[PDB]
Design an enzyme around this catalytic site. Structure first.
Site, PDB file in Angstrom:
ATOM      1  N   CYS B 106       0.833  -1.211   0.000  1.00 17.22           N
ATOM      2  CA  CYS B 106       0.000   0.000   0.000  1.00 17.22           C
ATOM      3  C   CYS B 106       0.865   1.258   0.000  1.00 17.22           C
ATOM      4  CB  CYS B 106      -0.949   0.047   1.193  1.00 17.22           C
ATOM      5  SG  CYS B 106      -2.077   1.528   1.235  1.00 17.22           S
ATOM      6  N   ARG B 109      -0.100   4.646   2.744  1.00 19.09           N
ATOM      7  CA  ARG B 109      -0.050   4.453   4.195  1.00 19.09           C
ATOM      8  C   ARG B 109       0.307   5.707   4.997  1.00 19.09           C
ATOM      9  NH1 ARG B 109       3.946  -0.182   4.917  1.00 19.09           N
ATOM     10  NH2 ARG B 109       4.260  -0.073   2.621  1.00 19.09           N
ATOM     11  N   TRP B 278      -9.152   6.135  -1.008  1.00 20.54           N
ATOM     12  CA  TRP B 278      -9.505   6.741  -2.275  1.00 20.54           C
ATOM     13  C   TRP B 278      -8.501   6.292  -3.330  1.00 20.54           C
ATOM     14  CZ3 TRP B 278      -8.470   9.801   2.090  1.00 20.54           C
ATOM     15  CH2 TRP B 278      -7.156  10.283   2.149  1.00 20.54           C
ATOM     16  N   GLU B 283      -4.385   3.486 -10.906  1.00 23.81           N
ATOM     17  CA  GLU B 283      -5.165   2.254 -10.800  1.00 23.81           C
ATOM     18  C   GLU B 283      -6.268   2.239 -11.838  1.00 23.81           C
ATOM     19  OE1 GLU B 283      -5.692   0.925  -6.470  1.00 23.81           O
ATOM     20  OE2 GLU B 283      -5.503   3.134  -6.316  1.00 23.81           O
TER      21      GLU B 283
END
Ligand code: HEM
Ligand code: HEM
Ligand SMILES: Cc1cc(N)nc2cc(-c3ccc(OC(C)C)c(CN)c3)ccc12
Ligand SMILES: Cc1cc(N)nc2cc(-c3ccc(OC(C)C)c(CN)c3)ccc12
Ligand SMILES: Cc1cc(N)nc2cc(-c3ccc(OC(C)C)c(CN)c3)ccc12
Ligand SMILES: C[C@H](O)[C@H](O)[C@H]1CNc2nc(N)[nH]c(=O)c2N1
Ligand SMILES: [Cl-]
Ligand SMILES: [Cl-]
Ligand SMILES: [Gd]
Ligand SMILES: [Gd]
Ligand SMILES: [Zn+2]
EC number: 1.14.13.39
Lengths: 401, 402
Positions: B106, B109, B278, B283
């Site tokens: 991730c 973070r 979000w 992506e």
């Protein structure tokens, strides 16, 4: 046997070749260090027996014949003198296999086409310098580039090593000033310092081709200025942005790495420069856009009238793409061999399949095979990979100061 | 003898001492690296419980306390009577945040401290489960000003089945296979789309049909639930200069809400704990829209841009891809829906790495996933060495319930 999947097609393969890796890498079950850039002579013989044994398997002739014969010659040679010499065809075979084994190299579809220049009869700096000049000339071939390696004498126990001091045969100068800022290539600032320190006259500006610093055993290195006509360069222009040429950017034609150690059958060649041809992202993205290299991205963006105020206009991405378009276009206009990252990665996929059929896998370093731009647009992005060390192999080595 | 990690852009060096605490084992050996793989009792439930309690009480600067030692004895006494134990509300909030903090792939973070934790451990049916989910979506979406949330459904316990969400995300588009052998809509969701239909859902025929939820209560078949259209905020995609772009009819949803991972906290397992943040615009633009096995619009975009498709060296793929990402960012900003571009994201991830090194002596990061799928070396994370390992609490993958 690691199960390796391609997530674009759904294919599954198993890497049985990984089961023969030896020299341990940096990772453990507790933690993966795969992103790190740098991770009684009896063992010389065991490394010789295995290397020779695949040589004869590679030519079918394992069992019977001079396969047996050649094992004793090396057995007896190390017994008497400590080291051994390789036959010429073995040295050719070892060079190609170490290229075939380089996990971070995306151009390996080409590994069978390699010209090996035997320089083991070498015994001087000027003798190395003429050998290097034949390499560059043959390898450049007026821009129709050809892979080449030149192998200098193997390190002997006691008495020094041949060793090129430049990381590459063609590198540009790096000069400081009051400001600590650098004029030229910042990656080559130290080796430029060692060039002035050895009696070289510095230069004008950004693109001064560094003189070679060649070092025969014991006696210290000596400068050798490269001839301008054999150092082939490409001035960068853009096909539609007319102002791009006036930025005065150039790059050289031949990537020729001269600071790695070649290991074959247990012998170490600290001077064995190899060369091929550029993938264009190496020039346009890494050498010219890296913040710690030439760092030109902002300048190209102002000329393109891009909104440099906010990161979400993707001005960095637009400007990088056009720099790469200029690199490809300029190299083609000058008729110099270059390959775009899409074509290169598509061929590396093809090499992965060949290497499956042949040896049952292929050591490959995902972080270095995926291009530094447009990563997931290339087929290697979605392809799982196994990284491990095979021999023969190219290895990094401490710099000589 | 802790790993030395170098930043190559600037020359930083630190040592990851947090990796020496990695209380799991990954797929790598000294003989080969498998870092690029996508998918890598009471005595031991006790040792993990004790480790988590030790963490929780260090975070409230109360280590070694009587309250600390009391809480250890309480959990040891509870796994004796019942084979398990219950988290307190504050321990659960801390543990969900730590799981986010510890997730190696991730890049968002930096935000791990700002997480809204909804406790749905008293949930009793799939119907209540739907109600908690709707409120999660309504809170997290927040009319486009998006908030990080997780909803925790009842933990796995012996003597009862698991709460499961069958959908991989709370919002997904259907994918209908065709007579061409082709797929209308999202190809990644063909399986769940068949499942929904064989559990009594009337399909559509668009390319952006939002899929119903399949929600499994303990020891029950999955129950089908349709999301109120006004609960699912959507962004029609347009380009700020390329006007034909709007006529591709592309859309994407506001809220990325992953709903098929397992949350693990001090040995307890929560197979239904959906979370949401979000989007990073890559992506959507690079992966969901340009992947050949996803919507695969790239050639169609480049053809309309009048680019030279016949040859790769024109870099038509790179140019088309960059404009698709421009369209995504502009469309989300037009609609006032939170969105972050990969330059802002990676810059803040670098701040996270710096914050994390001061606080815990390191940070688990998976380089191949932290580096964005376009323009990698244009971002600071490209030049940062990273160490990948598994700390607990943690989100984990789990097999599909079917
Ligand atoms: C002919 C076309 C070739 C292409 C396009 C090519 C491309 C590349 C690229 C893109 C890299 C990544 C380095 C970086 O980006 O920083 C690399 C590394 C490397 N290449 Fe190739 N190369 C070619 C020929 C060769 C040859 C002829 C050899 C050896 C004889 C070779 C051996 C290596 C080695 C040893 C490395 C680094 C080793 C490692 O870390 O695994 N390459 N190459
Ligand atoms: C607030 C904005 C957030 C952003 C921008 C973000 C960004 C990302 C991205 C880009 C990925 C990988 C996607 C891909 O590889 O295609 C990822 C993975 C992940 N994220 Fe985040 N995320 C956010 C919030 C959250 C939250 C709220 C949680 C949990 C409470 C979370 C937990 C995870 C996990 C578990 C993964 C997979 C990690 C792994 O498999 O190791 N993220 N994130
Ligand atoms: C034959 C050849 C062709 C090519 N087209 N490219 C090449 C790039 C490298 C190479 C190897 C290591 C390396 O980096 C070290 C500092 C670890 C870099 C630049 N980072 C380049 C080596 C050989 C190359
Ligand atoms: C909260 C959140 C926000 C965001 N903006 N993005 C996110 C992406 C993922 C995610 C996790 C795993 C994953 O892939 C597999 C390993 C399951 C993918 C797609 N590759 C995405 C998970 C959560 C995300
Ligand atoms: C090497 C690699 C790097 C990266 N950065 N990302 C990757 C994402 C996937 C991938 C492929 C399919 C897939 O999902 C199937 C279940 C459809 C998921 C998870 N959704 C991830 C596969 C490989 C990846
Ligand atoms: C930190 C990171 O591993 C490092 O910057 C690597 C990443 N991948 C790379 N890949 C290539 N081909 N060349 C590089 O210099 C790097 N740098
Ligand atoms: Cl270079
Ligand atoms: Cl998504
Ligand atoms: Gd102008
Ligand atoms: Gd327009
Ligand atoms: Zn590893």
């Amino acid at each position: 046997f690691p199960r390796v999947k391609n997530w674009e097609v759904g294919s599954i393969t198993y890497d049985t070749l990984s089961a023969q890796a030896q020299q341990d890498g940096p990772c453990t079950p507790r933690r993966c260090l795969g992103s790190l850039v740098f991770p009684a002579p009896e063992q010389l013989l065991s490394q010789a027996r295995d290397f020779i044994n695949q040589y004869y398997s590679s030519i079918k002739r394992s069992g019977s014949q001079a396969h047996e014969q050649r094992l004793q010659e090396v057995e007896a040679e190390v017994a008497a003198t400590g080291t051994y010499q390789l036959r010429e065809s073995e040295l050719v075979f070892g060079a190609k296999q170490a290229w075939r084994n380089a996990p971070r190299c995306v151009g390996r579809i080409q590994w069978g086409k390699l010209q090996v220049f035997d320089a083991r009869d070498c015994r001087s700096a000027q003798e190395m310098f003429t050998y290097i000049c034949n390499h560059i000339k043959y390898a450049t071939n007026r821009g129709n580039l050809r892979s080449a390696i030149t192998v200098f004498p193997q390190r002997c126990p006691g008495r020094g090593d041949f060793r090129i001091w430049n990381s590459q045969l063609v590198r540009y100068a790096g000069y400081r000033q009051q400001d600590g800022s650098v004029r030229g290539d910042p990656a080559n600032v130290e080796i430029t310092e060692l060039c002035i320190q050895h009696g070289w006259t510095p230069g004008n500006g950004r693109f001064d081709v560094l003189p070679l610093l060649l070092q025969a055993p014991d006696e210290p290195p000596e400068l050798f200025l490269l001839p301008p006509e054999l150092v082939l360069e490409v001035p960068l222009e853009h096909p539609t942005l007319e102002w791009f040429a006036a930025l005065g950017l150039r790059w050289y034609a031949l990537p020729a790495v001269s600071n790695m150690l070649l290991e074959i059958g247990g012998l170490e060649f600290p001077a064995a420069p190899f060369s091929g041809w550029y993938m264009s992202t190496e020039i346009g993205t890494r050498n010219l856009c890296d913040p710690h290299r030439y760092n030109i991205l902002e300048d190209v963006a102002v000329c393109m009238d891009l909104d440099t105020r906010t990161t979400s206009s993707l001005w960095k991405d637009k400007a990088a793409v056009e720099i790469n378009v200029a690199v490809l276009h300029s190299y083609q206009l000058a008729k110099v061999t270059i390959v775009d990252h899409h074509a290169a990665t598509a061929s590396f996929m093809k090499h992965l399949e060949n290497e499956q059929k042949a040896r049952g896998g292929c050591p490959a370093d995902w972080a270095w095979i995926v291009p530094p731009i447009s990563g997931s647009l290339t087929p290697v992005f979605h392809q799982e990979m196994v990284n491990y060390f095979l021999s023969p192999a190219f290895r990094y080595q401490p710099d000589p100061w």
